[PDB]
Amino acid sequence: GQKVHPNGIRLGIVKPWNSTWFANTKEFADNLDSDFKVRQYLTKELAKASVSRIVIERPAKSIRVTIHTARPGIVIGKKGEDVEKLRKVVADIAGVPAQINIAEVRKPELDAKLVADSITSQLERRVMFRRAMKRAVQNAMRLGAKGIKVEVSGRLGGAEIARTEWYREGRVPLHTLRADIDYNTSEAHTTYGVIGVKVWIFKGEILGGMAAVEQPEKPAAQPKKQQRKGRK
């Protein structure tokens, strides 16, 4: 049960992450704790709808949240008050003037954590968990994704002893280091004690994420190819 480190040692090497900001020096710690806080408190406020990825971003003089959903405009509310309130708390926690835009991910109507919600219910109510993980994978592969891995653990079925079980399908490489691929670890309790699902989902090996930049930044967009360079 060796459990190779399933995503951490795979990032930033043409594999995007759930934060994109710049910091350095000794204040990186003050910006990261603040980024954890805004991740924790902001998704709790827009929890009215289900949510597929979370991206928080800090460029020059601003804080920009990207969020991805199964339907757009849904966390943005009606009127515009609902979204000015989302921008009130993003500024309050980060301490910079705030932006949010709404966007959707590739294959939006499917996501890692909504599979684990589906598997958890049967277990929460202490009935019908012997085909549930398999039906979850079947539905999941009918809504998208090129392969899925599910691993369930717990005092499963409400049992008075522990069980590991899993279910894998299609094409889910494990040494992969190119394209973002979506991961969730659930943790929850019910009457008998704790359950959990580790849900790896695999969209694409060059589909989704960033791509490698195809130029230097050095020749492009430069209307004057000198300052002096000795040529005047």
């Binding site: 012997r130 398999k134 079980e165 899993w166 279910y167």
Partner: protein
């Protein structure tokens, strides 16, 4: 990918379930093996042993194998026209002619196997190995020693079987 036989009626008789171990070589995996019986209402030689990761995928595999390389077979009335003693691989079972006034008389999964077989009124004692995996061959070997009705006079009864091909 094969021809299959069907019945216009459902049978999902799960008889056994097991697990596969290698214990050090890749250690032990979660796989199950399963045995499932598919009749017809009058009988089939349909018996299927298959295997997969989980119990549902395993049974459905085994239910598939119970209807390929198999054909249905048929017997008129809820009795058998021969008092014969069917043996298959140390699991030995008995039959004697009877009334319709008795239906089944049997227990466990055996009462469910005999109902589709048409040999439930004639149901007499089993001996030798009578655990689930082999007890259930009633509708296989007990329908290969088969007799079934086709005559109008008992004294034409052997004459009528000869002219069926002569």
């Amino acid at each position: 990918a094969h021809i299959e036989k069907q019945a216009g009626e459902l049978q999902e008789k799960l008889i056994a379930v097991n697990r596969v171990s290698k214990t050090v070589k890749g250690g032990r995996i979660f796989s199950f093996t399963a045995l499932t019986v598919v009749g017809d209402g009058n009988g089939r030689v349909g018996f299927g042993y298959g295997k997969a990761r989980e119990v549902p995928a395993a049974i459905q595999k085994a239910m598939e194998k119970a209807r390929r390389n198999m054909i249905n077979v048929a017997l008129n009335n809820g009795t058998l026209q021969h008092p014969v003693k069917g043996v298959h691989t140390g699991s030995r079972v008995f039959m004697q002619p009877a009334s319709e006034g008795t239906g089944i008389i049997a227990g466990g999964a055996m009462r469910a196997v005999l109902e589709v077989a048409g040999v439930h009124n004639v149901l007499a004692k089993a001996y030798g190995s009578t655990n689930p995996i082999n007890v259930v061959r009633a509708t296989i070997d007990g329908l290969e020693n088969m007799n079934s009705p086709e005559m109008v006079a008992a004294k034409r009864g052997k004459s009528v079987e000869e002219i069926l091909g002569k």
